[PDB]
Design a protein around this ligand. Structure first.
Ligand SMILES: CC(C)CN(C[C@@H](O)[C@H](Cc1ccccc1)NC(=O)O[C@H]1CCOC1)S(=O)(=O)c1ccc(N)cc1
Ligand SMILES: [Cl-]
Ligand SMILES: [Cl-]
Ligand SMILES: [Cl-]
Ligand SMILES: [Cl-]
Ligand SMILES: [Cl-]
Ligand SMILES: [Cl-]
Ligand SMILES: [Cl-]
Ligand code: NA
Ligand code: NA
Ligand code: NA
Lengths: 99, 99
Protein backbone atom coordinates (compact mmCIF):
# COMPACT_ATOMS: atom_id res chain seq x y z
CA UNK A 1 0.00 0.00 0.00
CA UNK A 2 0.67 3.73 -0.10
CA UNK A 3 -0.06 5.20 3.33
CA UNK A 4 -0.60 8.89 3.76
CA UNK A 5 0.01 10.62 7.04
CA UNK A 6 -3.08 12.70 7.78
CA UNK A 7 -3.89 10.11 10.49
CA UNK A 8 -1.51 7.93 12.50
CA UNK A 9 -0.18 5.04 10.35
CA UNK A 10 -1.71 2.28 12.40
CA UNK A 11 -1.79 -1.27 11.11
CA UNK A 12 -2.70 -4.69 12.43
CA UNK A 13 0.16 -6.96 13.40
CA UNK A 14 0.08 -10.60 14.44
CA UNK A 15 2.50 -11.96 17.01
CA UNK A 16 2.07 -15.06 19.09
CA UNK A 17 -1.20 -15.80 17.29
CA UNK A 18 -2.59 -12.51 18.62
CA UNK A 19 -3.77 -9.50 16.59
CA UNK A 20 -2.62 -6.12 17.88
CA UNK A 21 -2.55 -2.56 16.58
CA UNK A 22 0.85 -0.95 15.97
CA UNK A 23 2.26 2.30 14.62
CA UNK A 24 4.58 2.31 11.63
CA UNK A 25 7.39 4.53 12.90
CA UNK A 26 10.24 5.67 10.72
CA UNK A 27 11.73 7.52 13.65
CA UNK A 28 12.13 4.32 15.68
CA UNK A 29 15.30 2.34 15.16
CA UNK A 30 13.67 -0.56 16.94
CA UNK A 31 10.35 -2.39 17.25
CA UNK A 32 8.92 -2.20 20.74
CA UNK A 33 5.64 -3.64 21.95
CA UNK A 34 3.66 -3.57 25.15
CA UNK A 35 4.05 -6.29 27.74
CA UNK A 36 3.28 -9.74 26.40
CA UNK A 37 4.66 -13.28 26.53
CA UNK A 38 7.27 -14.24 23.92
CA UNK A 39 9.21 -17.45 23.69
CA UNK A 40 12.85 -17.93 24.35
CA UNK A 41 15.51 -16.00 26.18
CA UNK A 42 15.83 -12.27 26.30
CA UNK A 43 18.73 -9.85 26.61
CA UNK A 44 18.78 -6.37 28.13
CA UNK A 45 18.51 -3.26 26.01
CA UNK A 46 18.26 0.48 26.61
CA UNK A 47 16.26 2.57 24.17
CA UNK A 48 16.02 6.31 23.93
CA UNK A 49 13.00 8.34 23.18
CA UNK A 50 11.75 11.83 23.55
CA UNK A 51 11.68 11.67 27.36
CA UNK A 52 14.88 9.72 27.97
CA UNK A 53 16.23 6.17 27.96
CA UNK A 54 14.40 3.11 29.37
CA UNK A 55 15.10 -0.58 29.86
CA UNK A 56 13.34 -3.15 27.70
CA UNK A 57 13.58 -6.90 27.05
CA UNK A 58 15.12 -7.89 23.72
CA UNK A 59 13.85 -11.04 22.06
CA UNK A 60 15.54 -12.03 18.84
CA UNK A 61 14.20 -13.96 15.84
CA UNK A 62 10.52 -13.52 16.62
CA UNK A 63 7.91 -14.25 13.97
CA UNK A 64 5.64 -11.32 13.32
CA UNK A 65 3.18 -10.36 10.56
CA UNK A 66 2.84 -6.64 9.79
CA UNK A 67 -0.11 -5.51 7.67
CA UNK A 68 -0.05 -8.96 6.14
CA UNK A 69 3.68 -9.04 5.45
CA UNK A 70 5.79 -11.60 7.22
CA UNK A 71 8.89 -10.69 9.17
CA UNK A 72 11.19 -12.52 11.55
CA UNK A 73 13.40 -10.33 13.72
CA UNK A 74 14.08 -8.55 16.97
CA UNK A 75 11.14 -7.44 19.11
CA UNK A 76 11.65 -5.38 22.24
CA UNK A 77 9.10 -5.62 25.05
CA UNK A 78 8.68 -2.79 27.58
CA UNK A 79 6.69 0.20 28.82
CA UNK A 80 6.01 1.89 25.50
CA UNK A 81 3.02 4.20 25.00
CA UNK A 82 1.95 2.31 21.85
CA UNK A 83 3.14 -0.72 19.90
CA UNK A 84 5.83 0.58 17.52
CA UNK A 85 7.09 -1.03 14.34
CA UNK A 86 10.56 0.43 13.75
CA UNK A 87 13.09 0.37 10.99
CA UNK A 88 14.48 -3.09 11.77
CA UNK A 89 11.14 -4.59 10.63
CA UNK A 90 10.05 -1.84 8.22
CA UNK A 91 13.08 -2.79 6.08
CA UNK A 92 12.09 -6.44 6.08
CA UNK A 93 8.66 -5.63 4.70
CA UNK A 94 10.19 -3.36 2.06
CA UNK A 95 8.90 -0.03 3.34
CA UNK A 96 10.17 3.23 2.02
CA UNK A 97 9.38 6.91 2.52
CA UNK A 98 8.45 8.73 -0.68
CA UNK A 99 7.80 12.37 -1.50
CA UNK B 1 12.79 10.97 -3.61
CA UNK B 2 12.48 7.43 -2.28
CA UNK B 3 14.14 7.00 1.11
CA UNK B 4 15.02 3.51 2.32
CA UNK B 5 15.04 2.72 5.98
CA UNK B 6 18.29 0.97 6.39
CA UNK B 7 19.52 3.99 8.32
CA UNK B 8 17.80 6.89 9.99
CA UNK B 9 15.90 9.03 7.44
CA UNK B 10 17.65 12.29 8.12
CA UNK B 11 17.28 15.35 5.92
CA UNK B 12 18.35 18.97 5.94
CA UNK B 13 15.81 21.53 6.97
CA UNK B 14 15.79 25.32 7.06
CA UNK B 15 13.92 26.91 9.92
CA UNK B 16 14.20 30.43 11.33
CA UNK B 17 17.09 31.15 9.01
CA UNK B 18 19.00 28.14 10.33
CA UNK B 19 20.06 24.87 8.71
CA UNK B 20 19.48 21.77 10.81
CA UNK B 21 19.42 18.01 10.41
CA UNK B 22 16.08 16.37 11.19
CA UNK B 23 14.48 12.94 11.24
CA UNK B 24 11.46 12.22 9.04
CA UNK B 25 9.24 10.55 11.62
CA UNK B 26 5.92 8.95 10.75
CA UNK B 27 5.50 8.05 14.45
CA UNK B 28 5.52 11.73 15.53
CA UNK B 29 2.20 13.60 15.43
CA UNK B 30 3.92 16.97 15.30
CA UNK B 31 7.29 18.48 14.51
CA UNK B 32 9.66 19.16 17.44
CA UNK B 33 12.95 21.00 17.17
CA UNK B 34 15.78 21.52 19.67
CA UNK B 35 15.95 24.83 21.49
CA UNK B 36 15.95 27.86 19.20
CA UNK B 37 14.25 31.22 18.87
CA UNK B 38 11.19 31.56 16.63
CA UNK B 39 9.12 34.68 15.95
CA UNK B 40 5.60 35.26 17.27
CA UNK B 41 3.32 33.96 19.90
CA UNK B 42 3.66 30.61 21.59
CA UNK B 43 1.99 28.53 24.24
CA UNK B 44 3.25 25.71 26.42
CA UNK B 45 2.58 22.04 25.71
CA UNK B 46 3.65 18.62 26.96
CA UNK B 47 4.52 15.83 24.50
CA UNK B 48 5.20 12.29 25.45
CA UNK B 49 6.84 9.19 24.18
CA UNK B 50 9.26 6.50 25.22
CA UNK B 51 10.76 7.67 28.43
CA UNK B 52 7.89 10.04 29.36
CA UNK B 53 7.08 13.66 28.60
CA UNK B 54 8.88 16.93 27.89
CA UNK B 55 7.62 20.50 28.00
CA UNK B 56 7.82 22.42 24.73
CA UNK B 57 6.75 25.78 23.31
CA UNK B 58 4.15 25.59 20.55
CA UNK B 59 4.58 28.09 17.69
CA UNK B 60 1.90 28.11 14.98
CA UNK B 61 2.18 29.12 11.31
CA UNK B 62 5.91 28.58 11.01
CA UNK B 63 7.53 27.96 7.62
CA UNK B 64 10.09 25.21 7.28
CA UNK B 65 11.94 24.07 4.15
CA UNK B 66 12.29 20.24 4.27
CA UNK B 67 14.75 18.71 1.85
CA UNK B 68 13.93 21.53 -0.59
CA UNK B 69 10.16 21.50 -0.02
CA UNK B 70 8.37 24.35 1.76
CA UNK B 71 5.62 23.71 4.27
CA UNK B 72 3.88 25.70 6.96
CA UNK B 73 2.47 24.55 10.27
CA UNK B 74 3.00 24.17 13.99
CA UNK B 75 6.47 23.72 15.29
CA UNK B 76 7.22 22.65 18.85
CA UNK B 77 10.48 23.75 20.44
CA UNK B 78 12.09 22.11 23.45
CA UNK B 79 14.62 19.64 24.80
CA UNK B 80 14.10 16.86 22.25
CA UNK B 81 17.10 14.59 21.76
CA UNK B 82 16.75 14.80 17.97
CA UNK B 83 15.04 17.25 15.64
CA UNK B 84 11.90 15.58 14.32
CA UNK B 85 9.67 16.36 11.34
CA UNK B 86 6.31 14.87 12.24
CA UNK B 87 3.14 14.10 10.38
CA UNK B 88 1.77 17.66 10.54
CA UNK B 89 4.49 18.74 8.12
CA UNK B 90 5.13 15.41 6.34
CA UNK B 91 1.62 15.60 4.92
CA UNK B 92 2.34 19.01 3.40
CA UNK B 93 5.31 17.74 1.38
CA UNK B 94 3.26 14.76 0.19
CA UNK B 95 5.19 12.12 2.07
CA UNK B 96 3.89 8.58 2.07
CA UNK B 97 5.01 5.23 3.38
CA UNK B 98 5.05 2.58 0.67
CA UNK B 99 5.36 -1.18 0.78
C1 LIG C 1 7.12 7.10 20.50
C2 LIG C 1 6.32 7.72 19.34
C3 LIG C 1 4.85 7.32 19.50
C4 LIG C 1 6.49 9.25 19.30
N1 LIG C 1 7.87 9.70 19.23
C5 LIG C 1 8.41 9.62 17.89
C6 LIG C 1 9.35 8.43 17.71
O1 LIG C 1 9.60 8.18 16.33
C7 LIG C 1 10.67 8.57 18.45
C8 LIG C 1 11.54 9.71 17.89
C9 LIG C 1 12.90 9.84 18.56
C10 LIG C 1 14.06 9.24 18.08
C11 LIG C 1 15.25 9.41 18.78
C12 LIG C 1 15.26 9.99 20.02
C13 LIG C 1 14.15 10.62 20.53
C14 LIG C 1 12.99 10.50 19.78
N2 LIG C 1 11.43 7.31 18.34
C15 LIG C 1 11.69 6.51 19.39
O2 LIG C 1 11.30 6.71 20.55
O3 LIG C 1 12.44 5.44 19.07
C16 LIG C 1 12.58 4.45 20.11
C17 LIG C 1 11.39 3.49 20.16
C18 LIG C 1 11.95 2.16 19.61
O4 LIG C 1 13.10 2.56 18.84
C19 LIG C 1 13.73 3.53 19.69
S1 LIG C 1 8.25 11.01 20.16
O5 LIG C 1 9.67 11.35 19.88
O6 LIG C 1 8.06 10.59 21.59
C20 LIG C 1 7.26 12.40 19.78
C21 LIG C 1 6.01 12.57 20.35
C22 LIG C 1 5.18 13.63 20.00
C23 LIG C 1 5.53 14.50 18.96
N3 LIG C 1 4.70 15.48 18.60
C24 LIG C 1 6.75 14.30 18.34
C25 LIG C 1 7.57 13.25 18.73
CL1 LIG D 1 -3.51 -3.66 20.43
CL1 LIG E 1 0.67 -12.46 26.05
CL1 LIG F 1 -3.33 -3.60 8.47
CL1 LIG G 1 15.78 -7.41 13.44
CL1 LIG H 1 10.87 19.02 30.12
CL1 LIG I 1 0.13 22.03 11.86
CL1 LIG J 1 -2.45 13.45 0.10
NA1 NA K 1 7.63 -13.79 29.31
NA1 NA L 1 14.65 -15.63 20.39
NA1 NA M 1 2.75 32.06 15.03
Amino acid sequence: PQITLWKRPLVTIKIGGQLKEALLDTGADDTVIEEMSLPGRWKPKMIGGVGGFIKVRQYDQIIIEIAGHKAIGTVLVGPTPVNIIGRNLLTQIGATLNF
